[PDB]
Design a protein around this ligand. Structure first.
Ligand SMILES: [Cu+2]
Length: 122
């Protein structure tokens, strides 16, 4: 009921599609950042939202700034998210699988690098 994801210096996630077993009651995303670049230069976060809510989350996120992990505080559109991390760091996030609906389209992405994205499916 977990998945390990890496966001590197070349602005790439090592997965573009996540599968969550609806049998799981909790899902865990373990984000790590291989490379040398610091959080202020190559910071990555892992954010989950519906495909439709993605742009809103990304724009309002960038405006919130680095100190707010490029995420709008208490954003109800963010189903789950990790903290912004720099190279060498690591951060995990666990969420209730019931926050997800079967058949709906979810996108996971990094707000400061929204092209680093993928799908999340139950
Ligand atoms: Cu990023």
């Amino acid at each position: 009921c977990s998945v390990d994801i890496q966001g590197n210096d070349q602005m790439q996630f090592n997965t573009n599609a996540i599968t969550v077993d609806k049998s799981c009651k909790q899902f865990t995303v373990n984000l790590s950042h291989p490379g040398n670049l610091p959080k202020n230069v190559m910071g990555h976060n892992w954010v989950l939202s519906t495909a439709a809510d993605m742009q809103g989350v990304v724009t309002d996120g960038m405006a919130s700034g680095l100190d707010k992990d490029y995420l709008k505080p208490d954003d109800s559109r963010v189903i789950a998210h990790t903290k912004l991390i720099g190279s060498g760091e690591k951060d995990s996030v666990t969420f209730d699988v019931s926050k997800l609906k079967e058949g709906e389209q979810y996108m996971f992405f990094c707000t400061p690098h929204p092209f680093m994205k993928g799908t999340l499916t139950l």
